[PDB]
Write a protein that binds this ligand. Sequence first.
Ligand SMILES: COC(=O)C[C@](O)(CC(=O)N1CCN(S(=O)(=O)c2cc3c(cc2O)C(=O)c2ccccc2C3=O)CC1)C(=O)OC
Ligand SMILES: O=P(O)(O)OC[C@H]1O[C@](O)(COP(=O)(O)O)[C@@H](O)[C@@H]1O
Ligand SMILES: O=P(O)(O)OC[C@H]1O[C@](O)(COP(=O)(O)O)[C@@H](O)[C@@H]1O
Ligand SMILES: O=P(O)(O)OC[C@H]1O[C@](O)(COP(=O)(O)O)[C@@H](O)[C@@H]1O
Ligand SMILES: O=P(O)(O)OC[C@H]1O[C@](O)(COP(=O)(O)O)[C@@H](O)[C@@H]1O
Ligand SMILES: O=C([O-])C(=O)[O-]
Ligand SMILES: O=C([O-])C(=O)[O-]
Ligand SMILES: O=C([O-])C(=O)[O-]
Ligand SMILES: O=C([O-])C(=O)[O-]
Ligand SMILES: [K+]
Ligand SMILES: [K+]
Ligand SMILES: [K+]
Ligand SMILES: [K+]
Ligand SMILES: [Mg+2]
Ligand SMILES: [Mg+2]
Ligand SMILES: [Mg+2]
Ligand SMILES: [Mg+2]
Lengths: 425, 425, 435, 422
Amino acid sequence: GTAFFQQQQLPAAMADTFLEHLCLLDIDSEPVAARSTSIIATIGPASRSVERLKEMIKAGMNIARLNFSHGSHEYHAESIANVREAVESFAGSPLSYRPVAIALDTKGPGSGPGLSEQDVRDLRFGVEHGVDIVFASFVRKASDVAAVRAALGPEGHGIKIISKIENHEGVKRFDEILEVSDGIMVARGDLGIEIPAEKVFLAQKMMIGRCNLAGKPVVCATQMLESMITKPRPTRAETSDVANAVLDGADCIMLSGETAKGNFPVEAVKMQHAIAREAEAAVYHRQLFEELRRAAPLSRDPTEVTAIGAVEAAFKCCAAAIIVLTTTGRSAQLLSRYRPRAAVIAVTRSAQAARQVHLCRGVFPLLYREPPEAIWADDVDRRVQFGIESGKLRGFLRVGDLVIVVTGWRPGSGYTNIMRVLSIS
Amino acid sequence: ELGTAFFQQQQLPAAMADTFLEHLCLLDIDSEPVAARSTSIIATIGPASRSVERLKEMIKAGMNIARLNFSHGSHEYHAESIANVREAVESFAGSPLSYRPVAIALDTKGPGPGLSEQDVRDLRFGVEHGVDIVFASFVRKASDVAAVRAALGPEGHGIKIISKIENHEGVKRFDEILEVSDGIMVARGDLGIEIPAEKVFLAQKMMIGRCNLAGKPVVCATQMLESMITKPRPTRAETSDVANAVLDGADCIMLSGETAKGNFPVEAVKMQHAIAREAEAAVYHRQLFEELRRAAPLSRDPTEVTAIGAVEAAFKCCAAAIIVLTTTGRSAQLLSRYRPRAAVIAVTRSAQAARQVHLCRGVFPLLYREPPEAIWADDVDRRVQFGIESGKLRGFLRVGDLVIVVTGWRPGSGYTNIMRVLSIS
Amino acid sequence: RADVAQLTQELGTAFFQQQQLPAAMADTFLEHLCLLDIDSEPVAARSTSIIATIGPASRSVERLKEMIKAGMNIARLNFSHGSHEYHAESIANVREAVESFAGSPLSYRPVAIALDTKGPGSPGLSEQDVRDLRFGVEHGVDIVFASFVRKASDVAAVRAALGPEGHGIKIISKIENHEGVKRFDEILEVSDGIMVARGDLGIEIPAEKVFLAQKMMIGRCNLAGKPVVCATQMLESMITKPRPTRAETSDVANAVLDGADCIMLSGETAKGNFPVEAVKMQHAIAREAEAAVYHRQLFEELRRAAPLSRDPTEVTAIGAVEAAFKCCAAAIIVLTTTGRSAQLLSRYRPRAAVIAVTRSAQAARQVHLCRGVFPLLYREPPEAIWADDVDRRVQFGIESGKLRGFLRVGDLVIVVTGWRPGSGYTNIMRVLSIS
Amino acid sequence: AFFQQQQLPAAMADTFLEHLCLLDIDSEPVAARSTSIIATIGPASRSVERLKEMIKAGMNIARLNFSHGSHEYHAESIANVREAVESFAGSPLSYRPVAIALDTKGPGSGGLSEQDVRDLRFGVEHGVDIVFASFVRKASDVAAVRAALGPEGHGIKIISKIENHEGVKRFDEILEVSDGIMVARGDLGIEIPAEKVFLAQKMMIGRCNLAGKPVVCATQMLESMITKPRPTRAETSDVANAVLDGADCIMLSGETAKGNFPVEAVKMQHAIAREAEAAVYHRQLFEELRRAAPLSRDPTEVTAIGAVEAAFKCCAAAIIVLTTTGRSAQLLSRYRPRAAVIAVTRSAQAARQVHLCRGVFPLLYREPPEAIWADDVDRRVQFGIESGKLRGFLRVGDLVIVVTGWRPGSGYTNIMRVLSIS
Ligand SMILES: COC(=O)C[C@](O)(CC(=O)N1CCN(S(=O)(=O)c2cc3c(cc2O)C(=O)c2ccccc2C3=O)CC1)C(=O)OC
Ligand SMILES: O=P(O)(O)OC[C@H]1O[C@](O)(COP(=O)(O)O)[C@@H](O)[C@@H]1O
Ligand SMILES: O=P(O)(O)OC[C@H]1O[C@](O)(COP(=O)(O)O)[C@@H](O)[C@@H]1O
Ligand SMILES: O=P(O)(O)OC[C@H]1O[C@](O)(COP(=O)(O)O)[C@@H](O)[C@@H]1O
Ligand SMILES: O=P(O)(O)OC[C@H]1O[C@](O)(COP(=O)(O)O)[C@@H](O)[C@@H]1O
Ligand SMILES: O=C([O-])C(=O)[O-]
Ligand SMILES: O=C([O-])C(=O)[O-]
Ligand SMILES: O=C([O-])C(=O)[O-]
Ligand SMILES: O=C([O-])C(=O)[O-]
Ligand SMILES: [K+]
Ligand SMILES: [K+]
Ligand SMILES: [K+]
Ligand SMILES: [K+]
Ligand SMILES: [Mg+2]
Ligand SMILES: [Mg+2]
Ligand SMILES: [Mg+2]
Ligand SMILES: [Mg+2]
């Protein structure tokens, strides 16, 4: 229908130049796709209540950030427990259950050279409490990441390390830091004090571009909706900042004082959700997919090869979703790096992977709880149907939609190799 | 892994270029072609190429389609030539490395206003003798194609109709002719008499471009190696013409008097084979695939969606081949329209589809004759492995190579929807 | 590397590390972002004009001299506040601060005066707007920022209220509501330019949609070759704090990257504790953002979207901008009476500064609306031979350019002139080497 | 109607594929033929009357093959060419200059041969404009030809013929010291596999276009026309593809030297080249030439790109340029404008040599001088406009781009002007 092609900035998406794309942007073209940029909310006194955390999960919070610069281990353990209680209160309905990752943000090495002794103790606390992600403060070189990795020990091998770039050295040694990190955070607060304030946007845009090229998650952080700490509505500069972080290519956007200590934590999450949805429809996919495709090197890894085939197939038919089965989240991450317009519905049995895939733009995790079927192909089919039924319930899919289904040839991680075109019945 | 020597062959430095101009500048006479020749050679069978022994030499030299010109000879003469072609083709049923299907094409005498009486009788002869293709002379409008289609009786609806555009009217009404035809032949002999000789190249390039856009086969014909009727080597203009027909986007190249009456029929086939191989490596796939992709409309047909995903996957890993299971040839034709560098190995049970897919550039048919397995998934696997083993035997594949496999979810034509990435073991 | 090798050996590797030149040579926008370098210092003069709203914090002649030195190009007088007497005194103080630098014509900086109307409030032009518009004509304002423009007839009403004596005043239509956005094309057609008035726009339409309206309007104005201003809350927190937030610097940079010709300061300069520091911050961000513009795609897209033209000024402008990019020209010196020849150069977004030499004091103030235009007011009486008068004006631009650091010995400059006196005859482009 | 002619619908296409799809056999070429025709002069094309017919048919450069004939024979051919050329000098607004090119025998079994030294000396003595140097294998071969031309042959253009594997492999070093290149397909097709010649041709044409130096496509382009009145389908395609590849010149050898249809072969090349030039996809070509061309601080180079950009912006009928050596016209030609480059020169040699550059139409200025240099320039510019009007390039109401310098003498081009005709 013509109405379908007027929504989600589709006239602007068909443009032959970026300039014509901008000219075709329409404030009356409503977003239809699910919001794909994850929201990280910092936990604090304004957002620790189990009832308030349920409201924040409903508003769109995907990752709960524990800022280890404030509070003791006992404070952070109560934070984790309240987060988990609010998250599990929705587990009774598996088709709508929303996993929420827990991220530990370290205090950092102040005047110190390597990992501080408080960071070693906090990192071990994170492993003991099962945190999914570490936002490592003031990462200046590859050896800082290795030290964080070593402090996590053998039991924390699965924890994702997102390096926070907060100073000139981190920006200059960015390539070597990205190579050993799982992702990056553009920590604009310290960065804006360490380098001239008028240069932070160059560092943000460069880091987001390089992370998009590398296919690794990038978070835009600090003062995105600052005035909402005290005011019910943000400034014109703040909504523009959130929209531009999404247009830049950020996988995640963050709220600090806005959720940790402010008077409007739920509204700040709702505002980021509303802006991100509008900005995602305004992305010029024609140029973006072409440039990601051109820049990505050749690969002999079947997961990487299946991912680009599936993203190309999704664009060809305007697929509502790409449903992928994943154990570690890697197959969903490889789909996400090509920035499909189609939602990537990731079905997994790993509760940790379901939480961690929120780092990748456009990945919607579904935690599958059923015990395995005796026939492996039936187990695969049951999981795919769970993705379809959840997708229908949540509004991602309707009967008649085309979906791309990504699976593997045998059980266990690392064997994704199949792409299949499916009609929703 | 593949080595620097691999990336110096088949014009790979010219293929990585960012502009067409830089691509031309990087063309290297020392960069040897490695891929199998993908543009089919149509040879006109006449007194110089009629004998079974001469036909075996022409099959070995590269002839894919035998053309019988019903403007000359008689029904009895052409039936004997057809029987000699089939005898020479079946003499290789012993060695899988030498057995290659050869299509039989009937070229009509032509039109008075509508279809001629002789054409009706010749078309009936073609149906009775099981011809695969009809090259319909002097097609001027859509109703001419409908008349040929009606003349293909109750038993010849599977025969492909390739409309020969030979005059101003055919050029002007090209779009309506292409819409109802299976393909087109740029019949340059009559076209060069009907319109100014200096305009034929415009008509050739336009028709090849529109056929490439439509995903329908296009043949370049007449005087390609004319001087080889009497001389053992062609002129500089002739080799250039063959190379440029391939670079233009032609699916097939043809030999007329060169093979029908000339002194060097086998040498003319060998020359077309040598030039086509060199020209195919010189194709600028980066721009071609992007333009075919951009111009092709969105599709909700799973075969079309799977085909673009498979071609994208093949380029990503430098796949040696795309193995496709097809009954009518349609799934192989849809892969061919995106012009993959990978060979499209089409595994089929249909002897007719195996001969007809020679019309599509880059399609290597394999006729499968094993009895169907009781379990459909095992029958599919047996055919996929047949494509791999024939590929290994013929030099398309080696252990460790990556192949793309295109299949459907259920038996019968019209259900292709799966693309798998396979490692050759 | 071959397309820059000889120029790299000549100008040096240090030259090609500055002003985001490695990012500018990128083949894709993605690679351009990846090559952005915080250590690549801006060299070019700041080309996006700063509009500062004048109020109690920025009214004194001494404070205005500091704001002119910090980079203020246009002084805005908001007729929603104050009075005729109050605004006349602010205007006189702006003119006194501006003329304190007139002693040296080779370095003098013109400042435009813009009147922002109160608006229609609760259908047509209000009676207060008619009186304020008349005040503007009587006080010789250069620009009118017309509030709440909703249709083409609103701009015709403002034009009529300016009368025959205000024919030269530029009308910049403020788009502040849904109707203005929907009828944008008809409004732009009859306006001299547009202002994305985000304060009211953010109340009239959902706050999360303002960025779509801003980006669309800036893109359409860039396509039309007409000035566009980004306004409201750009550095809001600087009303009370000496440093802005991370979102505020980002907003200023993104307005410039979007294609805005001007950026504005409202409460930041009208009532804030740091008016000069707010101007300095906008200046610092705009210079960094201008160097980060991906000119390769921008110039190609402006060129591809612009229709063919038989107007020699339009034809000369694209030839001059192409020539400037080819040699990395330090400047394009253009002679203009109305500012139009400089505006046509500005629409192709050259990296080279457009030094506009004019005898019209009003055109010198008004060209601040066009990105990258640096006005030079020529005060000498005309030479007897017209060709010598033209040559003197070109040399005035070169000497001012050398004195201000815009030009250096060895630089190439593009000079744009016409074949006969009077407006509308620009048709010549010359390549000159600076000695 | 203007936008239906000269493949303008195909020129507005957003992709090369859509450009091909929009090519129309009914879209007639309007622009003057840009690719020069080189005709080999021999027994079939030696008479003054036959040469007048060949000049009228479109011959721009007369080639004398020093592998055949003798010094006396070639001197008589040269005198006949000059007599046929000067028979049109009575009307200076329509006079067509014709270059004279000497094609050397080559080194054969051996540096520069002794016959080549004598033939090169003959060329200097007879005032030839160009040398097509046979079997150039390396940069030192070009230096040897340059030395054999001596001080009196400082201004003869050396076009290196690439005829073997070594010439192809050492192409970059040869192009660097040569004025241009000839893709000599006859020997090249014997020296390397015949099926690889198209790769060498396309590579060399691309590199010469990149370098802004003339490239000639040669041998067997219309071979069958040696005995038949019409060419084959492969032959017309070859001529069209050489033009679409980016060749500045196309050549006729036996077709004009010994063939039964020399005038018809020239007419056929003219007809094909005109059709192929309109079919060029300028949108991609100009963009790629622009992107690949390096940044420059030379004002002639800077003015040239500004003038070509301005010409495309207004659909200028022509770019009128004043040149002494032909260099300013060559720098305009390298950007492949659709607008004709009308080069007004006082140098008879530069007028002949500038036929090597695609789209350059030389006008030999023989009008009285103006006392004021500024008046003399304006007169040479109005001369371009009167010749352009007479020859069909320009009409009243057309826009032209005029390229001049700031001071007399070569090397000072720095001005571009937009002018309305009459
Ligand atoms: C004025 O004759 C014409 O009609 C001109 C003509 O060009 C035909 C025409 O004379 N041609 C075009 C074809 N070539 S051909 O490709 O070499 C050719 C030859 C033959 C045969 C087919 C064929 O294509 C053949 O089947 C045959 C059968 C039995 C004995 C001999 C032959 C035979 O010689 C010969 C020259 C046209 O337009 O066809 C309608
Ligand atoms: O993204 P990952 O972690 O590589 O997981 C992909 C794996 O998931 C699957 O689709 C399903 O595997 P399981 O049955 O073990 O869950 C495998 O076939 C595939 O290899
Ligand atoms: O190209 P076609 O004619 O549609 O044939 C493709 C068909 O071949 C298959 O891959 C195999 O089917 P069969 O087992 O019937 O041969 C189907 O699943 C698919 O629909
Ligand atoms: O930009 P505008 O307003 O058209 O002015 C450009 C005009 O300025 C000139 O360069 C100089 O003209 P004046 O001598 O009138 O100042 C004219 O030749 C040209 O027409
Ligand atoms: O192309 P060339 O050889 O550099 O010649 C261009 C020269 O021609 C002119 O336009 C006219 O010069 P002349 O008056 O000497 O003929 C010069 O101003 C310019 O330097
Ligand atoms: O650490 C942070 O979040 C910062 O500095 O912005
Ligand atoms: O019929 C043909 O093949 C022709 O006319 O070229
Ligand atoms: O009117 C204004 O300036 C606004 O609304 O921002
Ligand atoms: O010398 C030549 O021209 C050739 O060999 O083609
Ligand atoms: K912290
Ligand atoms: K026939
Ligand atoms: K106001
Ligand atoms: K010779
Ligand atoms: Mg910090
Ligand atoms: Mg025919
Ligand atoms: Mg307002
Ligand atoms: Mg030779």
